[PDB]
Curated annotation (Swiss-Prot):
Signal peptide: none annotated. Ubiquitinated by SMURF1; leading to proteasomal degradation. This is Ubiquitin carboxyl-terminal hydrolase 5. Belongs to the peptidase C19 family. Homodimer. Interacts with TRIML1. It comes from the Eukaryota. It is found in: Cytoplasm; Cytoplasm, Stress granule; Nucleus. A zinc finger (UBP-type) spans 3-111. Zn(2+) binds at residues 27, 30, 47, 60. Deubiquitinating enzyme that participates in a wide range of cellular processes by specifically cleaving isopeptide bonds between ubiquitin and substrate proteins or ubiquitin itself. Affects thereby important cellular signaling pathways such as NF-kappa-B, Wnt/beta-catenin, and cytokine production by regulating ubiquitin-dependent protein degradation. Participates in the activation of the Wnt signaling pathway by promoting FOXM1 deubiquitination and stabilization that induces the recruitment of beta-catenin to Wnt target gene promoter. Substrate binds at residues 37, 49-52, 87, 89, 92. The chain holds residues 173 to 289 of 858 of the full protein. The UBP-type zinc finger domain crystallizes as a dimer linked by a disulfide bond between the Cys-23 residues of both molecules, but there is no evidence that the full-length USP5 exists as a dimer. The UBP-type zinc finger domain interacts selectively with an unmodified C-terminus of the proximal ubiquitin. Both UBA domains are involved in polyubiquitin recognition.
Length: 117
């Protein structure tokens, strides 16, 4: 392998004061509680793409990307002190965010307190 996102150091985050718990997240837009992605620009929590067999998510995170251009999302439940799964929609890859700890702090998340799913 994963390479540093071209957005890791230039990302401009919006001020979103909503409290984000350490576990038991929900899609803002549906019942989903798995394949939930936190968009690092706006703090939106939304579900991953639908699988070919119609399982998986309801496309809410990717729809939000197409509407906004906000490129980086981190998969809740993968955040450890060592890192997380971060996807970049405009680079179409799993990427490194060496600023991840800051990006998550901005929305009041402590990486040392999040729980592995
Ligand atoms: C976050 C995003 C989604 O599901 O909305 N996502 C996540 N992982 C991927 C892995 C490979 C190819 C595409 C995606 C993707 O769109
Ligand atoms: Zn959803």
């Amino acid at each position: 392998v994963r390479q540093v996102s071209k957005h890791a150091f230039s990302l401009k985050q919006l001020d979103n004061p909503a409290r984000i718990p350490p576990c038991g997240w929900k899609c803002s837009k549906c019942d989903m509680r798995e394949n939930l992605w936190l968009n690092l620009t706006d703090g939106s929590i939304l579900c991953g793409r639908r699988y070919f067999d119609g399982s998986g998510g309801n496309n809410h995170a990717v729809e939000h990307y197409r509407e906004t251009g906000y490129p980086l999302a981190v998969k809740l439940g993968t955040i450890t002190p060592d890192g997380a799964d971060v996807y970049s929609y405009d680079e179409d890859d799993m990427v490194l965010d060496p600023s991840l700890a800051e990006h998550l702090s901005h929305f009041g998340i402590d990486m040392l307190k999040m729980q592995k799913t």
